[PDB]
Amino acid sequence: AAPTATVTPSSGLSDGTVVKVAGAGLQAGTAYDVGQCAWVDTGVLACNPADFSSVTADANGSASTSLTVRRSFEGFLFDGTRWGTVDCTTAACQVGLSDAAGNGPEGVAISFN
């Protein structure tokens, strides 16, 4: 998993722990709309289509910027079930890089306060 974004921290953060973040599809100074989902029982992944945040790639194509490691919020599977404005720390949400195409999901399970 070379192409992927990650956040310095990975637990003991806070609701909107905007910390340093690097990595992504490893494009090249390309845009990488930040994303945040909630990985529960695997089959239950409530993505957060409210990330908004956007990270830019660096030469190589690796993102580099501060991403908000939200803690609690309202997530949604995708078209079946909805998480809800609840704590994500219970589902060890995750924050990764996202394109304007909504490529595959992330894999940065961070422990939110």
How far, in whole angstroms, is CA 80 from its chain's centroid?
20
Structure determined by:
NMR
Residue 76 exposure: Cα atoms within 13 Å on the Cβ side: 6
d(CA 14, CA 3): 26
Structure-token pair, residue 18? 């905007």
CB 98 within 8 A of CB 51: yes
Q: Which of 103, 110, 105 is nearest to 68 (CA)?
A: 110
Percent helix, strand, coil in the chain, to 5, is 5, 50, 45
CB 6 within 8 A of CB 35: no
Question: Structural domains in the chain?
Answer: 1-113 (2.60.40.230)
